[PDB]
RNA sequence: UGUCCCAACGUUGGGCCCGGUGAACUGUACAUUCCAGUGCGGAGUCUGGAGACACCCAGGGGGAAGCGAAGACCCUAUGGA
RNA sequence: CGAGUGGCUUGCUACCUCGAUGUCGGUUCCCUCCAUCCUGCCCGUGCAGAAGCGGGCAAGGGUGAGGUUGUUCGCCUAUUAAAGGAGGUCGUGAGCUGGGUUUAGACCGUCGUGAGACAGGUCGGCUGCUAUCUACUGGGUGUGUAGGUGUCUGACAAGAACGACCGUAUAGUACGAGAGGAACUACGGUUGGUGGCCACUGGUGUACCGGUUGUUCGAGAGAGCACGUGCCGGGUAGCCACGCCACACGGGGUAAGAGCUGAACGCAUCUAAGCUCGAAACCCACUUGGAAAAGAGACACCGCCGAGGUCCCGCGUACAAG
């Protein structure tokens, strides 16, 4: 509830990675970002493998633990984290000043960062975060 | 060559620690099949005795014969729905929306709660129906509590408040069914929900035993042969291998035992009566005398005598309910002897 | 096998010596195995009422001594439970040698036999004196 | 049923049915009665016994 | 015959909390780690990740190649007995 | 004959430790691998049936008990769905054990002039430490989130919470000359595991009651001591197990596989695009944990001079302190 985002990005049909990279880019310049419609974000490749990766990451852990998220909320933010020095006090701030959202809880339509948009007419091999999530066994709340 | 063997104890009731509420809390609920209704009750554990019965099971060759069954007596005096709680659907799970209360409060509901003085039972209702119009109305549950006073054997008076779920035909129907149950005074009883013969799930906080060794806590073996006269009698060989250079959690150690919550599955209801038909001679040891609203449960039940145990229509029943079983003889013979 | 219609608490172990309840020429029998039973690490193999066991002939006629034969538990000292809750214990532990089809190798049976034994082995039962 | 030692009515769903070497049957209502017979006592001499009352 | 199946309950002294008395071992430093990797080829301290709010009580000892003893085993010494 | 993979064995190498990283075997307790012994779904057959034989997916679960031997190994028995193999300093001695290897004593054989030797055999021959750090099991005190009471939510985490067998009917049926002899499905039970409970059976019960030996208080009455009850008989509560209760089905997605539609390639083709199905395995379901989830949550009510809480007092459904 209420996040004075300087920038509202729309992940719909966009390549998650490329997106998380540009967000990290801005969150480091102080920019208060909010990513929207994560469930509709996309990551290219062969589904059956892309999932193994994500599944494996869930199995991974022991006592200390390796908390890997399953919701398309977490998945995205965690991906963004990896593009930031989240442990240095400067990057923590940059991270925390960034938030991912399921759907669009805002009034304005999000914007699509350049070159992040995927062409559905030209690509058939890709996955919706939502699919992966449901696959991982997450509860489809969106 | 190291003969195989399953591990000692289950990693499914962990972490084996003290429970947060001496009152059990259900995680799952029965699906919305028949007419609108509350899906759970409660009462205080009284004790053990046997009831002689007629073999009900149509697939028992012995069908129709005498048969002695163990029964845990439990006092189930009428509980009271004091409000209707409604959750809404958000992309972050289910969250409470509001509550609609009454005015008629039990003379002692203040020993636990900060009983309401000025509530709006219409605007909340209003807001609820509005969420329903929108299509974001998640399930409906009533805040319920007991009358420990109603059970003399139970020393406590301070009511054990707790939320049970209402699920009926449509959502509208049970919203109303809910509203009405409340509006009056919230008073309801076992018969209202359950029926003898049916299968229910009895959740309860087990008898507490303090800190205990691994032998009693995980069912590991005491030392054997010569090993036992060596200075180690009730402790494992090792905490783990060299590497990983650490002690896992999967290894059985000393700790808290008992006073954990368990939702014991598929308990049959023999009979639901009232009066002293069940009570024993001398009196239910460490408990007292029973006389009033009760329920007879087949087998064991979590917790010691006097502990609150909740009921819920079995969510994963294996057998079809063989209603109102014939009760030929309920033993009243003393427990001491 | 078919239900005994009663709850048993095994009174025997592999290695237990018992009484041979028949005119077979066997007096003392030694338990050896338990048909259809696999234990768990360290647990010594338990045998109770109405169990088809495997036995070594301990004492008796020089023809019957040392013979590996099958048999059926017919009496034991540990209390076994009936439907109505009562308990039932015997004087001693015993079994009657049996063959492949499960028909007694001997002619007559000595001493009593629990009624629950009948339901699993009728051929042995229909040859009984007292059926308690 | 009735106890074949003491003679007190036996509570249904309670007891042991001892079977002797000859074949005879003896229902006891308690462990007290069993061990009182295993000593060599006869229900007649024991005063607390209903047989004796 | 509790050696074992297969453990239970009990007794006595400790154990635990309070008053009083009051040592030793051991200590390059830093030290909340875990999974991998890497290095004189067996890392809490390097590299990459993961995880980690601080303090405390009790425990059985997984790791510190834990502490104790300048290896008795092996070879070397223009050593000894 | 040719190409390789693993790092259980053996050997080679001499990088690492000789101011010491405790041996072999065993035990106990914990996680793992798959190159699968059983269990689930498949394929082929020299597949009638039943029973097998060979291969594929598959690591959920299981994989037990004993006789000789220090043995590992292995040989043998009876059971068994099957009684698979391997990694973790050939996992585990600041856990146990110490039977073997390998001190000092001694005997035999062999060798030797001899002291004495042996990759020959045999008898006897010790197991230190008060945990500082870390780690995990359980338990408390503070701080943060920024007044209190009660009820919640669920990021995530844990589960094997269940595995397997026998039997009845289907059936003396299908199939088969005959002998023999299935299945789907429905039931009942056992076993292993798991969680809880004590009406019942059993244990305990140096609470309690009784019998009795010795001795002392003169006798009697009533008592003390006899190791923490003299011994014996009985035994309540409770705690217990050898006692008793409870522990799915079904969906969703797939593998090996069986197929559909279908082109590249007019045809054909299960695959390339697309679609239907299909494993004890995977996701949900179900049980337990869980606002310190830093995005540090939600609701309701009370209260901010007063709601509520602590100490106090009598006690436990709780308990080593807390
Ligand atoms: Cl983890
Ligand atoms: Cl960083
Ligand atoms: Cl594509
Ligand atoms: Cl041991
Ligand atoms: Cl066997
Ligand atoms: K060395
Ligand atoms: Mg009792
Ligand atoms: Mg009784
Ligand atoms: Mg063993
Ligand atoms: Mg690091
Ligand atoms: Mg030196
Ligand atoms: Mg030397
Ligand atoms: Mg010299
Ligand atoms: Mg070297
Ligand atoms: Mg060491
Ligand atoms: Mg394979
Ligand atoms: Mg066949
Ligand atoms: Mg595994
Ligand atoms: Mg080793
Ligand atoms: Mg091992
Ligand atoms: Mg060690
Ligand atoms: Mg040592
Ligand atoms: Mg030795
Ligand atoms: Mg020797
Ligand atoms: Mg020796
Ligand atoms: Mg020590
Ligand atoms: Mg005394
Ligand atoms: Na991509
Ligand atoms: Na994970
Ligand atoms: Na000792
Ligand atoms: Na010791
Ligand atoms: Na003992
Ligand atoms: Na340690
Ligand atoms: Na080697
Ligand atoms: Na060293
Ligand atoms: Na060893
Ligand atoms: Na497997
Ligand atoms: Na052997
Ligand atoms: Na080592
Ligand atoms: Na040692
Ligand atoms: Na050892
Ligand atoms: Na499936
Ligand atoms: Na909080």
UniProtKB/Swiss-Prot annotation, chain A:
<comment type="subunit">
    <text>Part of the 50S ribosomal subunit. Interacts weakly with proteins L3 and L6.</text>
</comment>
<dbReference type="InterPro" id="IPR005822">
    <property type="entry name" value="Ribosomal_uL13"/>
</dbReference>
<dbReference type="InterPro" id="IPR023563">
    <property type="entry name" value="Ribosomal_uL13_CS"/>
</dbReference>
<dbReference type="GO" id="GO:0019843">
    <property type="term" value="F:rRNA binding"/>
</dbReference>
<keyword id="KW-0699">rRNA-binding</keyword>
<comment type="similarity">
    <text>Belongs to the universal ribosomal protein uL13 family.</text>
</comment>
<protein>
    <recommendedName>
        <fullName>Large ribosomal subunit protein uL13</fullName>
    </recommendedName>
</protein>
<dbReference type="InterPro" id="IPR005755">
    <property type="entry name" value="Ribosomal_uL13_euk/arc"/>
</dbReference>
<dbReference type="GO" id="GO:0022625">
    <property type="term" value="C:cytosolic large ribosomal subunit"/>
</dbReference>
<dbReference type="GO" id="GO:0006412">
    <property type="term" value="P:translation"/>
</dbReference>
<dbReference type="GO" id="GO:0017148">
    <property type="term" value="P:negative regulation of translation"/>
</dbReference>
<comment type="function">
    <text>This protein is one of the early assembly proteins of the 50S ribosomal subunit. Binds to 23S rRNA.</text>
</comment>
Swiss-Prot record, chain B:
<keyword id="KW-0699">rRNA-binding</keyword>
<dbReference type="InterPro" id="IPR044892">
    <property type="entry name" value="Ribosomal_L3_dom_3_arc_sf"/>
</dbReference>
<dbReference type="InterPro" id="IPR019926">
    <property type="entry name" value="Ribosomal_uL3_CS"/>
</dbReference>
<dbReference type="InterPro" id="IPR019928">
    <property type="entry name" value="Ribosomal_uL3_arc"/>
</dbReference>
<comment type="similarity">
    <text>Belongs to the universal ribosomal protein uL3 family.</text>
</comment>
<keyword id="KW-0694">RNA-binding</keyword>
<feature type="compositionally biased region" description="Polar residues">
    <location>
        <begin position="21"/>
        <end position="30"/>
    </location>
</feature>
<feature type="compositionally biased region" description="Polar residues">
    <location>
        <begin position="246"/>
        <end position="258"/>
    </location>
</feature>
<dbReference type="Pfam" id="PF00297">
    <property type="entry name" value="Ribosomal_L3"/>
</dbReference>
<dbReference type="InterPro" id="IPR009000">
    <property type="entry name" value="Transl_B-barrel_sf"/>
</dbReference>
<dbReference type="GO" id="GO:0019843">
    <property type="term" value="F:rRNA binding"/>
</dbReference>
<feature type="region of interest" description="Disordered">
    <location>
        <begin position="311"/>
        <end position="337"/>
    </location>
</feature>
Swiss-Prot record, chain C:
<dbReference type="GO" id="GO:0003735">
    <property type="term" value="F:structural constituent of ribosome"/>
</dbReference>
<dbReference type="GO" id="GO:0070180">
    <property type="term" value="F:large ribosomal subunit rRNA binding"/>
</dbReference>
<dbReference type="GO" id="GO:0006412">
    <property type="term" value="P:translation"/>
</dbReference>
<dbReference type="GO" id="GO:0022625">
    <property type="term" value="C:cytosolic large ribosomal subunit"/>
</dbReference>
<dbReference type="InterPro" id="IPR019972">
    <property type="entry name" value="Ribosomal_uL14_CS"/>
</dbReference>
<dbReference type="InterPro" id="IPR019971">
    <property type="entry name" value="Ribosomal_uL14_arc"/>
</dbReference>
<protein>
    <recommendedName>
        <fullName>Large ribosomal subunit protein uL14</fullName>
    </recommendedName>
</protein>
<dbReference type="InterPro" id="IPR000218">
    <property type="entry name" value="Ribosomal_uL14"/>
</dbReference>
<comment type="subunit">
    <text>The L3/L14/L24e cluster may contact the 16S rRNA in 2 intersubunit bridges. Part of the 50S ribosomal subunit. Forms a cluster with proteins L3 and L24e.</text>
</comment>
<dbReference type="InterPro" id="IPR036853">
    <property type="entry name" value="Ribosomal_uL14_sf"/>
</dbReference>
<keyword id="KW-0689">Ribosomal protein</keyword>
<keyword id="KW-0687">Ribonucleoprotein</keyword>
UniProtKB/Swiss-Prot annotation, chain D:
<dbReference type="GO" id="GO:0006412">
    <property type="term" value="P:translation"/>
</dbReference>
<dbReference type="GO" id="GO:0008270">
    <property type="term" value="F:zinc ion binding"/>
</dbReference>
<dbReference type="GO" id="GO:0003735">
    <property type="term" value="F:structural constituent of ribosome"/>
</dbReference>
<keyword id="KW-0694">RNA-binding</keyword>
<keyword id="KW-0862">Zinc</keyword>
<keyword id="KW-0689">Ribosomal protein</keyword>
<feature type="binding site">
    <location>
        <position position="29"/>
    </location>
    <ligand>
        <name>Zn(2+)</name>
    </ligand>
</feature>
<dbReference type="GO" id="GO:1990904">
    <property type="term" value="C:ribonucleoprotein complex"/>
</dbReference>
<keyword id="KW-0863">Zinc-finger</keyword>
<comment type="similarity">
    <text>Belongs to the eukaryotic ribosomal protein eL24 family.</text>
</comment>
<comment type="function">
    <text>Binds to the 23S rRNA.</text>
</comment>
<protein>
    <recommendedName>
        <fullName>Large ribosomal subunit protein eL24</fullName>
    </recommendedName>
</protein>
